[PDB]
Amino acid sequence: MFTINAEVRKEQGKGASRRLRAANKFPAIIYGGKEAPLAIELDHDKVMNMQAKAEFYSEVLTIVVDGKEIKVKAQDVQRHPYKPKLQHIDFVRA
Amino acid sequence: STRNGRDSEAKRLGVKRFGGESVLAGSIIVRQRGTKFHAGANVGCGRDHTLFAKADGKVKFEVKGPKNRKFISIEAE
């Protein structure tokens, strides 16, 4: 049910992702096997709160990238070692 | 505490002529302890498993073998 807005990532790397995570946004990617993977950036406070629901990891979400909507499922996540934060979310194109 | 403090002189092992080097016949390529690099084409194997050139040319390292063993070979180029 959750619909999350996201934008494509212009630059990628280490210094180009710690730059994002200091602006209350974290990177994530969508991969679905038969299609080219889509690396996107998306907000933190609007997805850290929504992940608190147990249903975030069980239903088919929706991501709005450049107008179109992609139905995905949360495949994996990386969390900060000692803070209530996120670093990456792996989305599989369900 | 005590009952220690002994060591042996370093034996100066290792690869002496790295890949792509032009060697003369009979020049030591690698000084070994076991057989880590095996003898390939146009190289020998001394009693210490020392790999020496047998005909002058350019050294070349290879990974031939069913067991993925390192072979040192020489091309007379």
Binding site: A54, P81, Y82 | -
Partner: protein, 136 residues
């Protein structure tokens, strides 16, 4: 007091303690006491912080200790000059990195664990935090 039996080597190098920890998740239990600081945490500060929380929950519930010292720390005696050999082993410490989940417990209501873990975090040199099992 936790300490390995039949270890390969009697004395070990000092080494350094850099990086983030590996066991950062609550897997065996439901509520955990995740470390936030850095520094060695010995074998007596584990038992002293364990009794404090196997007693604050009476005796019911399961308790998991996810660290083990396995690191001998020597100490030169008093009035002994320097050199003349490495000192003898005196205690065992467990190196802690920020992120390690030290203790975890299950079978209790959350507010009881959140108080039991408070009486154990007062016996540990390093800062700690209370973390809860997550879906992943």
């Amino acid at each position: 007091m936790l300490q390995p039996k039949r270890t390969k080597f009697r004395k070990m190098h000092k080494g350094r303690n850099r990086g983030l920890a590996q066991g950062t998740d609550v897997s065996f239990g439901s509520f955990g006491l995740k470390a936030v600081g850095r520094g060695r945490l010995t074998a007596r500060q584990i038992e002293a912080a364990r009794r404090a929380m196997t007693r604050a929950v009476k005796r019911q519930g399961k308790i998991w200790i996810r660290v083990f010292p396995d690191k001998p720390i020597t100490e030169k005696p008093l009035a002994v000059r320097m050199g003349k050999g490495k000192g003898n082993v005196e205690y065992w410490v467990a190196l802690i990195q920020p992120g390690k989940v030290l203790y975890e417990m299950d079978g209790v209501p959350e507010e009881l664990a959140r108080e039991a873990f408070k009486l154990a975090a007062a016996k540990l040199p390093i800062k700690t935090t209370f973390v809860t099992k997550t879906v992943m």
